[PDB]
């Protein structure tokens, strides 16, 4: 397909960059698995996408296939002065260069900024039983877990980001918590400080404790006090209450399946590859291992609506009153947001009738690994009609009554970065509005209970407390609008006050249409202040037949607001958060607006999104981008235990076509039906596809759980 | 059963009613039918909802039922002095008494703000045929139809309201247009303006005419002008192979053919909910519904986990707010509760209105009839699933397995009608989540109202077609939430974060800014009355005074979906009809003389209507402690675009607003679902798969497809 230049590796390919990689033995290469951070290893390899200018050459003007290549992230571990290095590695097929990629000069704290990684996991554990080994008595008076020959009751530790005060240091707060089923659930009250910046782990240190309010410097004097009486001690079958297993009676207990959807006539969408085509619909897609799913060369009605629709980052910023708590600001893609695609249960996470998707990962791996239904694809009723009229004669009866069944083609997948899963969807409707839906679900950050932590969150049990937090969540969109120069423009609704043209002692107050340009960057980023026009549009030079410019129209649906304050240390990470909307002129240096390395150093992260206005360029009739902003605050509740569940619990935007076809169209449509009166006779159903009744069973349920190389 | 007491009127209760006014031979009723304004009349007959004490009592203490009446709406125009008054009827059964009922007295304009009714239209198009005969050859040449000796090829006009500059006149402006197919969408360039408040249609007149950019004094006027060939016309094409613009036909194809039918819902089980009357059980939740003929669905005391969450959710008010570059363009301010905005609940199709699996419901309305009238499928309640879980996760072993993956199948209660009062059709859903969320929906479709186009018409909207323009407006809806969480005793707070900047505890050198969570305490009615410039509180938490057990005030947050802003400036003119929609949130003290934010009335009086909502807040009543009513309003601003043609479609065109528990509940409520899923791993061996419910692969068919589009007494 042509769809192919956007196509994530295959796994035969990710074995071939990584053979090619491991051939060079100048390199030192070696497992991710191997229990060291003083070794050189690949982290990540992932199809890097051709540039635009080459893409649109092969795809609308018919040149040569672009150079595929892939984005290899290499940790130099085993070397004097650690860093993190880039390189493209291709051609594909057959790779035989290793291009390093944007080099940063001055910049020291590469190493410091990378994100952490299973071995490094294992060699955190091993610090903690070494250290926490005077605690043993008191780990079990306490709570009845410990460290050593615990077995099936051994405590855990979540551990949070960022990690430290300032670029270069790696040092994390980790939460000790109770190794049960959803430990995340499980705060014991200790919360410990551990240097691990060294690539020799046996350097590592407890630099600090946290227990029940007070800090103890060590893990000794904690120890001596609880020993003397100086320390306040928190002494810690129906379903544990972090466990999903149904407890509880309804008063009108329901006791058979709900309705389900069947599709006795497959798919109505053609799925080719990576290809998608539906109705007036054409896409591609992909899942970039680092930052998550992305639509790619939309198009409706033959024409191009967006060259891009991605997903760029996904945060979660804290208050606590713990150490932890006020240093959580979780940003997933230094997590590897688009390679935690963990397995979609058929039935629950998409429809029985879905198309289930798999993929290959390569993130923090030995080898490729097969990720089992790791996308969906899925058409559904909507419950709600496309477009229905009831065209009365108001004497009793009807002319027509003219009715669209709702329905709509959505692509998913999750992320499960830890705690959270979030639930990503691209949904298109057949009248060539598309949105982009991220749900919220799976187990809240939570802190040990103290009263000092009702300021910044919700006592949820015994020794819980749900942490108050915004999620933000960074898309970039660009629209390619019928074309790749566009302009952007808004429209509101002003007031006039005339003289009443019929009546001249009398006044019309009555609204008109108010049109504002943009010219320049900074005129089209939109902060939280500021109230956003009800109209966002994105236009072509042409008209429709009506004689009004072609465009699309963003609409965003969001709670966000202002977070952290621009110019404030960490908030140099999310300057895109300060912008519900931002357009940028389209450049090859500007394609994400976070990276994985942003977790870890957001003080002196290698993208600022602010620095993509600095230029404030001129934004008339050209390749523009526009970068979205969505969120909401949550204020945790009880109704959050176990889990935070999806009603109300999601945030997106919607694409519509305004003026960009002549009309409806999802006029095209077979689906429609028109029933008309006949004297004296039955009404005539006019119908473009039979009536259906036909029923047929899904596949049988079942579920994998394993994700493994092949 | 208890939920009788919030229940419509039966076809056997309304003919009761209508036969005991009957009887009463003083009040000389004739039927709505008669095709004079000079009569006696009863225009509409709905349930009276008792007092709130008095049910309360019934339902909570079990005490007497309470008393059952009928509202009945009398239009007295056989007299010197026509009126409006209504009665409470009663009781029911056996009517004996017509007491007075929202009394006006020292009010005399109640006659011109009534409702039009089908007697009216038919006077109104006989007084066009005769006033517009000097017009008759311009129509014939200028459009190919016509008012007189016209059989396939009529014009037909659309009125705009309200009808005049002031309380207590009746002048409309007449949008004529060919009566074809979608008609609504072919205006002809030509509006009237009819004064029709007199009793005597003989009376009546066009006192005003206006076509293609240009006002006329007169029909004769216009006449002469264009048979001395001084008027600029424009000459339709004739509208009577491919569809009709204006069609919902299919035309053009999809370059990707669907054939076959898409996905549908099958329910071999049955429902899952227990609809018996009124009265509806979904697992945690027990609510009873009405379909309130003047004012629309309402949802009364809903329940979930045996616990009171709310007496009453109601749609108060629909509108639709236009500009206009024509004369009726500019005067468009519809109130649809003028219309009956509960007695167009036309046949829902199903398969495409609601699910073929859906319980579909009958009613009977009596609004503008000579009998009740049988309204097939004017309501449907149906579960669907969502398409997403309600809540999953997958718990992984970070080493290429899982310790288990936890799902639950998103599945919602959907309880819908629709009004379709003209050309727009509203789709009005309740929505109920297993876990104790409802959600207030509605979904805009149907035709825009479009005035004929001239350069001048782009300032105050978008050329849609030839000689079409789609009008600039505000579509905006009011709802009332008597919200009673756990009780009638409820106060009201706010939640937000602020930012604190202290010493970081562990790196003294440093700061930490970072959220605290803030809350703010409303003591009185202008508070919590949020008006558009302000920034709304991102929590907006209705509390009992109970704690749950982790020490957290029990309360229900109320969470809005709106684009909607001020449209009309304060205090001018006809906003006093609509001044609730200052307020996206205001909170009032419960009193049974505030129950409605509108009125049948205010369409045709917004200068002086009988309910201004702004005067609930007037008194700044004490809000602790006390049985509070939240009021919503929502909306959006619609510029429409020619995808709008032939009809606005639903997909980004809703607004509505959620109730969510907020530390109401222990923990998730959901929790008691049998629906959930564990899938666990076992060491060599395949997964266990956790459930409490045998896995569904079974099939059944709904009835076929039937539609009878008919509404006729039974
Ligand atoms: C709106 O119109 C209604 C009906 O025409 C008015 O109610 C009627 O009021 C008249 C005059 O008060 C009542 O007529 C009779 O008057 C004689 C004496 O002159 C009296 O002895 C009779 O008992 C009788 O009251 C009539 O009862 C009453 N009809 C009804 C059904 O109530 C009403 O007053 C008008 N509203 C306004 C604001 O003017
Ligand atoms: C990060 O470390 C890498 C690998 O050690 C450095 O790249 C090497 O630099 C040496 C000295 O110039 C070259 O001779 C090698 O060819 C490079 N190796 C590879 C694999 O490219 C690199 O200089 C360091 N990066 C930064 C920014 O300091
Ligand atoms: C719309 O404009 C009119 C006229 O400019 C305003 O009416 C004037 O208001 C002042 C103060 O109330 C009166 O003294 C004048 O006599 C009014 N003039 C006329 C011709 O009516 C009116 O207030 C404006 N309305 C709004 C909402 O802006
Ligand atoms: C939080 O408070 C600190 C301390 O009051 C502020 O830091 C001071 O900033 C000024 C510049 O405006 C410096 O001259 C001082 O040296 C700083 N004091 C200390 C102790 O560092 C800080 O700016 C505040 N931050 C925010 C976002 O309000
Ligand atoms: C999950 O998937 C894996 C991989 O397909 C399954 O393991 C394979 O099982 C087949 C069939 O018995 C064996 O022949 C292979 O040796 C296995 N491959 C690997 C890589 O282990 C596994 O059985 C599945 N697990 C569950 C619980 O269904
Ligand atoms: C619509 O429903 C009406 C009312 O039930 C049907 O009208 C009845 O039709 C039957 C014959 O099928 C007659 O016996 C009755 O006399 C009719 N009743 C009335 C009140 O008219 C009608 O047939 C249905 N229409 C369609 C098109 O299905
Ligand atoms: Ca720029
Ligand atoms: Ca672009
Ligand atoms: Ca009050
Ligand atoms: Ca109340
Ligand atoms: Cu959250
Ligand atoms: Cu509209």
């Not at 030192?28 to 199809?47: D, G």
């Not at 046996?202 to 007070?214: C, F, I, L, P, T």
């Not at 688009?338 to 996470?349: F, M, Q, R, W």
């Not at 039979?690 to 493994?708: A, I, K, V, W």
């Amino acid at each position: 397909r042509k769809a192919g230049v956007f196509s994530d590796l295959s796994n035969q390919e990710l074995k071939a960059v990584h053979s090619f990689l491991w051939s060079k033995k100048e390199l030192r290469l070696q497992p991710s698995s191997t229990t060291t951070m003083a070794k050189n290893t690949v982290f990540l390899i992932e199809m890097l996408l051709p540039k635009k200018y080459h893409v649109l050459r092969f795809l609308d003007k018919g040149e040569r296939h672009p150079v595929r290549e892939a984005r290899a992230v290499i940790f130099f571990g085993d070397q004097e002065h650690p860093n993190v290095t880039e390189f493209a590695v291709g051609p594909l097929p057959g790779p035989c260069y290793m291009r390093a990629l944007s080099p940063r000069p001055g910049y020291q704290s590469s190493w410091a900024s990378r994100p952490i990684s299973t071995a490094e996991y294992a060699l955190l554990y091993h610090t903690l039983q070494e250290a926490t080994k005077p605690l043993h008595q008191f780990f079990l008076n306490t709570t009845g877990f410990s460290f050593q020959d615990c077995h099936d009751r051994c405590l855990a530790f979540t551990d949070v980001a960022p990690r430290g005060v300032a670029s270069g240091q790696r040092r994390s707060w980790l939460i000790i918590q109770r190794y049960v089923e959803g430990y995340f659930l499980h705060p014991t009250g200790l919360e410990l400080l551990v240097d691990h910046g060294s690539t020799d782990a046996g350097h590592w240190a407890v630099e600090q404790v946290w227990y029940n309010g007070k800090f103890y410097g060590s893990p000794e004097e904690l120890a001596r006090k609880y020993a003397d009486g100086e320390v306040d001690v928190v002494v810690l079958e129906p379903p544990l209450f972090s466990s999903h297993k149904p407890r509880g009676d309804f008063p009108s207990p329901i006791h058979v399946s709900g309705p389900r959807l069947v599709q006795p006539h497959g798919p109505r969408f053609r799925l080719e590859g990576n290809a998608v085509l539906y109705g007036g619909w054409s896409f591609a897609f992909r899942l970039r291992s680092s930052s998550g799913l992305q639509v790619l060369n939309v198009h409706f009605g033959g024409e191009r609506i967006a060259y891009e629709v991605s997903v760029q980052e996904a945060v979660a910023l804290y208050g606590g009153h713990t150490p932890a708590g006020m240093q959580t600001k979780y940003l997933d893609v230094g997590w590897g947001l688009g390679s935690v695609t963990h397995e979609l249960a058929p039935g629950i996470d998409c429809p029985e009738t879905a198309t289930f998707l798999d993929t290959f990962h390569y993130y923090d791996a030995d080898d490729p690994v097969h990720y089992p239904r790791a996308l969906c694809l899925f058409e559904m009723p909507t419950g709600v009609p496309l477009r229905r009229h009831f065209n009365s004669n108001f004497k009793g009866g009807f002319n027509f009554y003219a009715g669209l069944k709702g329905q709509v083609l959505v692509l998913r997948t999750t992320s499960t970065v830890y705690n959270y899963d979030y639930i990503w969807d691209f949904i298109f409707y057949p009248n060539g509005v598309m949105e982009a839906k991220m749900h919220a679900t799976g187990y809240v950050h939570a802190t040990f209970y103290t009263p000092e932590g009702l300021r910044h969150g919700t006592r949820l049990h015994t020794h819980l407390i749900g942490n108050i937090h915004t999620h933000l969540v960074h898309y970039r969109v660009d629209l390619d609008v019928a074309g790749t120069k566009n302009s952007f423009q808004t429209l509101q609704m002003k007031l006039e006050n005339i003289t009443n043209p019929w009546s001249p002692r009398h006044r019309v107050v009555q609204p008109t249409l108010e049109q504002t340009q943009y010219s320049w960057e900074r005129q089209a980023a939109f902060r939280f202040k500021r109230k956003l026009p009800k109209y966002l549009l994105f236009t072509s030079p042409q008209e429709n037949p009506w004689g009004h410019k072609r465009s699309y129209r963003l609409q965003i649906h969001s709670m966000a607001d202002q977070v952290l304050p621009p110019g404030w240390q960490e908030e140099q990470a999310i300057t895109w958060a300060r912008y519900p909307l931002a357009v940028t002129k389209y450049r090859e240096s500007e394609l994400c607006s976070s990276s994985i390395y942003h977790q870890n150093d957001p003080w002196d992260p290698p993208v600022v999104f602010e620095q993509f206005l600095h230029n404030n360029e001129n934004i008339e009739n050209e390749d523009l981008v526009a970068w979205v902003t969505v969120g909401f605050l949550h204020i945790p509740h009880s109704e959050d235990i176990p889990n935070t569940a999806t009603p109300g619990n999601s945030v997106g935007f919607l694409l519509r076509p305004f003026n960009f076809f002549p009309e409806d169209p999802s006029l095209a449509s077979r689906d429609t039906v028109i029933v008309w009166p006949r004297d004296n006779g039955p009404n005539y159903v006019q119908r473009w596809i039979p009536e259906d009744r036909d029923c047929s069973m899904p596949p049988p349920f079942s579920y994998n759980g394993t994700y493994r190389p092949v």
